[PDB]
Amino acid sequence: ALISQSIKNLKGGISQQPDILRYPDQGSRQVNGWSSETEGLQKRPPLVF
């Protein structure tokens, strides 16, 4: 009861495996994201004309 968890590094991208087998640092859908290391998940760099 009152179980809690926290993940300090979600830089693992996405994973199509069933969530039972998914690693804690893997999402289900990541679009326009940059899984930078040492700075966490970031929005992808802007597109300069």
UniProtKB/Swiss-Prot annotation:
Disulfide bonds: none
Coiled-coil zones: none
Compartments in which it is found: Virion
Subunit-structure text: Interacts with head-to-tail connector protein gp8, the tail component gp11, and the fiber protein gp17.
Function field: Structural component of the short non-contractile tail. The tail complex is involved in viral genome delivery. Forms the end of the tail, including the canonical tube, the nozzle, and the small extensions below the fibers. Once the tail tubular structure is formed, the interface between gp11 and gp12 generates the proper environment to interact with the six gp17 trimers.
Protein name: Tail tubular protein gp12
Organism: Escherichia phage T7 (Bacteriophage T7)
